[PDB]
Ligand binder design. Structure first.
Ligand SMILES: [Mn+2]
Length: 300
């Protein structure tokens, strides 16, 4: 029972939102390379089986645990009860796989999947609606906790939870069962400070995505008004240990260590697999992230 478990995400191989990126890379190549690199587990991708027996049939022979899966929320247009029914299939799969977390994100009005929409036109939730949105998220979180699953909210570019102020609003209007998924890459991309977010909310963090960014490319997205998927194809994201990145990982992991964080560190770095070889960059990500966690005192 290692306290800290290192996972990966299959979008470094095949992107979910833009199905042309890594379409040629089979599920088999993705999982073989993820296991060969040394990851303890992997998160859901769009090529994964969604039935317990079939999913174990591909994961267990490779020694990969099912970390979690992304689940889209539509609390801004659907009732809380309908959203509870929507996540139940995901909860069933996670329990059978032994997963302890469900990753969630409000995507009813999100634009990260719209290749033609500039990221600056992303949705902003009207101020008065935060309280009700929070009650809905926490209602889903209490529902999942009753079945042994912890809901972790994934702040994300192109959604209503993008900036550091909006992360603060979410945490303010949720609790006690709602946890935060701290994604370092999305936080900095959204002009936030990963270290400051961790200092504020580490007690509520239940899942960590160690995602890096190339500052050069992020500023290209801003200056030229590009879409999220345009930025992904240009290399807006990369892995821990890449000298082209700008995220400072040790301070964040040090805050986690000081509060006794237990759970997953996941390297999630979508890139164009033709240009940024997934085996190479995910290999560099795992090596570098373990070194950072050792330096931070997080992994003893
Ligand atoms: Mn993420």
């Amino acid at each position: 029972h290692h306290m800290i478990l290192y996972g990966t995400n299959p979008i470094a191989w095949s992107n979910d939102d833009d199905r042309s990126l890594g379409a040629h890379i089979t599920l088999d190549q993705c999982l073989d390379e993820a296991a060969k690199i040394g990851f303890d587990g992997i998160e859901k991708g769009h090529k994964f089986p969604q039935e317990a027996a079939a999913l174990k049939a591909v994961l267990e022979p490779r020694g990969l645990r099912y970390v979690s899966g992304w689940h889209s929320l539509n609390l801004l247009v659907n009732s809380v009860e309908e959203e509870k029914a929507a996540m139940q299939p995901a909860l069933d799969l996670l329990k059978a796989m032994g997963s302890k977390v469900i990753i969630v994100c409000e995507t009813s009005n999100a634009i990260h999947g719209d290749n033609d929409k500039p990221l600056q036109e992303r949705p902003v939730l009207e101020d008065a609606r935060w309280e009700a949105f929070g009650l809905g998220v926490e209602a889903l979180a209490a529902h999942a906790a009753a079945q042994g699953i912890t809901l972790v909210y994934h702040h994300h570019m192109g959604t209503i939870v993008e900036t550091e102020d909006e992360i603060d609003r979410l945490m303010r209007f949720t609790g006690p069962h709602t946890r935060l998924l701290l994604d370092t890459g999305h936080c900095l991309f959204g002009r936030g400070n990963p270290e400051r977010v961790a200092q504020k909310h580490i007690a509520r963090v239940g899942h960590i995505h160690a995602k890096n960014i190339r500052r050069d490319i992020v500023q290209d997205v801003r200056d030229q008004n590009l879409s999220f998927l345009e930025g992904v194809r240009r290399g807006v994201f990369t892995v821990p240990g890449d000298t082209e990145g700008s995220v400072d990982f040790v301070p964040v992991l040090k805050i986690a260590a000081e509060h006794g964080y237990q759970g997953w560190l996941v390297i999630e770095a979508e890139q164009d697999p033709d240009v940024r070889n997934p085996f190479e960059y995910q290999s560099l990500g795992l090596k570098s992230l373990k070194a950072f966690a050792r330096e931070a005192g997080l992994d003893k």
